[PDB]
């Protein structure tokens, strides 16, 4: 929190109006309080995602979003050139208020568990049409391209008569009269050439698709008759649309799918041209401002416009078929999104381990609100959050979506559910079996057995578990209210199965797999990575060396690895104002501390990154590079001007090894280790780096009281990857002196047991709160805007880990 000066400063109180302005070009974020400027801005922040307005709060408030237009009347005029936010709402969806990444919601029968939500990216708004410019039309295609283009104009004019349009000198929707409707030659030739070229583009894009079209029968062109057009269909100018008619023409299913792609490419190409001109999207059309509702990539475009465009392309495809030219649909080109990992994406909800059952006959239910990918079943207490349910041996689950049973792999079983279907899960530990029922009917394997799994080893017990894929919803009923169970009576009651939570006094606590990367100690049994604590000889300081166990072998895992040291170094509260043997007075007085990293020969310095990370680093990025690092500048100044200060905040302070690799050595594998030393001055707040003794140009400045963890981000390329060297330079203290108070004045390097290497882990278990804040969101009115309210207090006892500031 950084104080900001504004007239009549005070914590947000009733009747306060806060105006937020975002300029993506600078980029900058600015605020106004009751119309008065707030003397401070955010700038230079990252732009790698989509931005949305947000308000965060605790219990005891009522606020109102004002988004302009009919969704809230602004109390103060927006600054020049700033669009009201209500315009930003996408064509498909209507404006409303949402929570952010909720893993559950309420519902009439109970709480619904929710899987991850698929969210757009800033790139999704960039139209990416396939380029047909390189393509040259076939000679035969040249003959049809022209006449087809004229017929397409005739089709559009004919559609316009249905639109009710009449020829107009100036086109007005209110006027009902259009100048754009004219005989191809009557139409301005630069406008007509645009129609002709566009029809040519459609043949060219068919070529891009790769469909092969050679004109087949001349008689086919003779067979088609242009539909006769009435004077009423004719314009006030009297130009009459003369589209050819082809009732006989029919479209193959592969051809119909082709018509969708062509329309998409056509919408995508039209959007690119408009953007090049300078147009932009807007929910409300503004021609003078070059703002259009249509100007959004095809996929985002609304379904009605999709079908209109598809109808135009379908008619044009049918006209091409009607001439007689045969177009062969191109073979389907494989493409897999592979955007995410299955296990890290799907969220797993399980009961708390203390509820594990080691005996008896137990029952519970899971209703699939959506038909999508979910898994439901029984899991062992030591289940892992990273792994997909059932891929390992710790979970026995059922994935109805495809109709499979999962344990140590997938096997067909049962039938898929539909929306609203209830899966009843039973476990019998007396007989060591697991059973699944769908809507009260036992699910049977192809072999005909009524047990999904048999010969279950009780081991440490079992817990209810469910996994939800992105955009999925499921209602889990552990059966505390036995009357609430739907099919328990139909199946499971007489057989002697007991609802999992039958005699519990409070609802069963649950844990979900939270996909927030966190640093954890490197496991001693990790198959790929090993860390060896090396003692410090006379010539060498203490070290922590990382090696790749499985390098050079099939099944080896190679991916970005983020490592830090378990303890931080904390900068002083107040910053200072403005032989080869260390001198005693200097070494005792110095506030500078040093640690180095040795990249072994054969490991790519271009793949190594070295530096520091603040406690709040949670990025697990396989494509990491220094450009991804979060950063933002907070600038404070006086209202008249004269910026007082500008502070750069980031969570990662590192230098790339490519900077130190010499240009000649680049592209060649060196045989010499690369040593990068990191120096921090706790009193000054200054951070510097050296490479092989030489000083790097990179330097950083941090605010007082900051905590920094030594960190290395590396993509392994050799059996020996990197080594943390905890030593000292002349007249510079070792890291242990900063880390531990008892050693504050001891200059001998050392690595106590507490100091260890931790690796970033994508997912971890987290406990779902038993109660949730009750937030009411509505639309107060067209003038009032949208209303958010939360009145009931809610508190928890928080346990704080001081070193990790978590």
């Amino acid at each position: 929190a950084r104080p900001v000066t504004s007239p009549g400063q005070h914590l947000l109180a009733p009747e306060d109006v806060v105006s937020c302005c975002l300029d993506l070009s600078v980029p900058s974020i600015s605020f106004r309080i009751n119309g008065c400027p707030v003397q401070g801005v955010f700038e230079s922040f990252n732009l790698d995602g989509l931005f949305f307005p947000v308000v965060s709060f605790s219990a005891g408030i009522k606020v109102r979003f004002l988004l302009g237009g009919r969704h809230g009347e602004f109390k103060f005029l927006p600054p020049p050139g700033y669009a009201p936010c209500h315009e930003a709402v996408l064509p498909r969806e209507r404006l409303h208020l949402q929570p952010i990444k909720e893993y559950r919601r309420e519902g009439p029968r109970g709480p619904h568990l929710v899987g991850p939500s698929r969210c757009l990216s800033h790139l999704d708004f960039v139209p990416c049409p396939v380029d047909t410019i390189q393509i040259v039309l076939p000679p035969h295609l040249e003959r049809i391209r022209e006449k087809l283009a004229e017929n397409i104009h005739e089709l559009w004019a004919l559609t316009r008569i249905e639109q009710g349009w009449t020829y107009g000198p100036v086109r007005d929707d209110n006027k009902r009269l259009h100048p754009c409707l004219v005989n191809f030659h009557s139409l301005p030739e630069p406008e007509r050439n645009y129609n002709l070229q566009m029809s040519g583009e459609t043949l060219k894009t068919l070529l891009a698709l790769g469909c092969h079209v050679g004109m087949a029968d001349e008689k086919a062109e003779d067979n088609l008759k242009k539909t006769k057009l009435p004077k009423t269909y004719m314009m006030s100018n009297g130009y009459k649309p003369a589209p050819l008619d082809l009732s006989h023409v029919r479209l193959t299913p592969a051809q119909t799918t082709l018509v969708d792609r062509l329309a998409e490419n056509g919408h995508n190409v039209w959007a690119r041209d408009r953007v090049a001109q300078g147009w932009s999207y807007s929910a409300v059309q503004d021609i003078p401002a070059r703002r259009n509702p249509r100007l959004v990539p095809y996929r985002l475009l609304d379904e009605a416009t999709k079908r209109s465009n598809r109808d135009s392309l379908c008619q044009a495809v049918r006209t091409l078929l009607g001439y007689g030219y045969n177009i062969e649909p191109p073979d389907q080109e494989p493409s897999q999104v592979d955007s995410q990992s299955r296990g890290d994406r799907a969220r797993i909800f399980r009961a708390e381990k203390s509820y594990a059952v080691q005996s008896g006959r137990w029952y519970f239910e899971f209703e699939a609100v959506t038909t999508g990918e979910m898994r439901v079943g029984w899991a062992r207490p030591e289940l892992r959050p990273d792994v997909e349910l059932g891929a390992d041996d710790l979970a026995y689950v059922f994935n109805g979506h495809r109709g499979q049973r999962w344990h140590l792999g997938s096997e067909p079983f049962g039938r898929p559910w539909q929306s609203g279907d209830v899966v009843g899960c039973m476990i019998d530990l007396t007989e060591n079996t697991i059973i699944f029922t769908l809507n009260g009917e036992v699910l049977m394997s192809d072999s005909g057995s009524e047990t999904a799994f048999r010969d279950i080893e009780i081991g440490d017990g079992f817990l209810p578990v469910c996994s939800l894929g992105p955009g999925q919803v499921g209602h889990l009923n552990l059966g505390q209210d036995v009357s609430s169970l739907r099919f328990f009576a139909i199946c499971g009651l007489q057989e002697g199965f007991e609802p999992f939570a039958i005699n519990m006094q409070r609802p069963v606590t649950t844990w979900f797999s939270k996909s927030l990367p966190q640093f954890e100690p490197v496991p001693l049994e990790h198959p790929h990575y090993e860390v060896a604590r090396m003692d410090g000889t006379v010539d060498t300081p203490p070290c922590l060396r990382l090696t790749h166990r499985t390098w050079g072998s099939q099944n080896s895992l190679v991916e970005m690895l983020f490592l830090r040291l378990s303890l931080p170094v904390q900068f002083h509260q107040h910053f200072r104002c403005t032989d080869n043997r260390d001198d005693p007075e200097i070494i005792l007085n110095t506030t500078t501390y040093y640690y180095s990293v040795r990249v072994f020969a054969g490991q790519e310095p271009s793949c190594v990154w070295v530096g520091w990370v603040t406690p709040d680093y949670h990025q697990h990025d396989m494509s990491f590079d220094l450009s991804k690092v979060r950063a933002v500048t907070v600038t404070m100044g006086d209202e008249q001007g004269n910026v007082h200060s500008s502070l750069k905040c980031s969570n990662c302070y590192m230098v790339w090894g490519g900077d130190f690799v010499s240009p000649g050595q680049q592209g060649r594998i060196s045989h010499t280790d690369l040593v990068i030393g990191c120096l921090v001055d706790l009193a000054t707040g200054l951070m510097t780096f050296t490479a092989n003794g030489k000083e790097s140009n990179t330097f950083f400045q941090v605010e007082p009281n900051t905590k920094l963890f030594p960190a290395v981000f590396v993509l392994p390329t050799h059996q020996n990857v990197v080594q943390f060297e905890l030593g000292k330079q002349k007249n510079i203290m070792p890291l242990s002196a900063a880390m531990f108070l008892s050693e504050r004045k001891n200059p001998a390097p050392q690595c106590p047991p507490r100091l260890e290497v931790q690796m970033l882990m994508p997912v971890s278990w987290s406990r779902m709160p038993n109660h949730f804040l009750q937030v009411d969101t509505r639309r107060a009115g067209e003038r009032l805007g949208w209303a958010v309210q939360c009145q009931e207090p809610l508190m928890m006892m928080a346990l704080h880990i001081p070193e990790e500031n978590r």
Partner: protein
């Protein structure tokens, strides 16, 4: 050096005077951001008479500056606060203290 910064406005007219009991809620934090004391946790306003030298000097000046109904942040330097000795067990030696003090009433 005690520095006072308004968080919420007060009347601006009523100021504590010597011998007059001040009633407050306060939440105390060390400079680095750890909370050590809070009257709201106890759920009972803290009462003290100005001039009795019973609260610490930073409080004396800060509350003297504040006005009835005002909420403010007081940043109190070490030598105004307990100082070198500190408060054993609670406050470390040479610690600046940040207080969120609201002056409910004067009596």
């Amino acid at each position: 050096g005690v520095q006072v910064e308004t968080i919420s406005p007060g009347d601006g007219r009523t100021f504590p005077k010597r011998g007059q009991t001040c009633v407050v809620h306060y939440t105390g934090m060390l400079e680095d951001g750890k909370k050590f004391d809070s009257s709201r946790d106890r759920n009972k306003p803290f009462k003290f008479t100005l001039g009795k030298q019973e609260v610490i000097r930073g409080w004396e000046e800060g509350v003297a500056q504040m006005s009835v109904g005002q909420r403010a942040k007081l940043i109190i330097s070490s030598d105004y606060a307990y100082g070198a000795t500190g408060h054993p067990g609670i406050i470390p030696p040479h610690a600046t203290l940040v207080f969120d003090v609201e002056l409910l009433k004067l009596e």
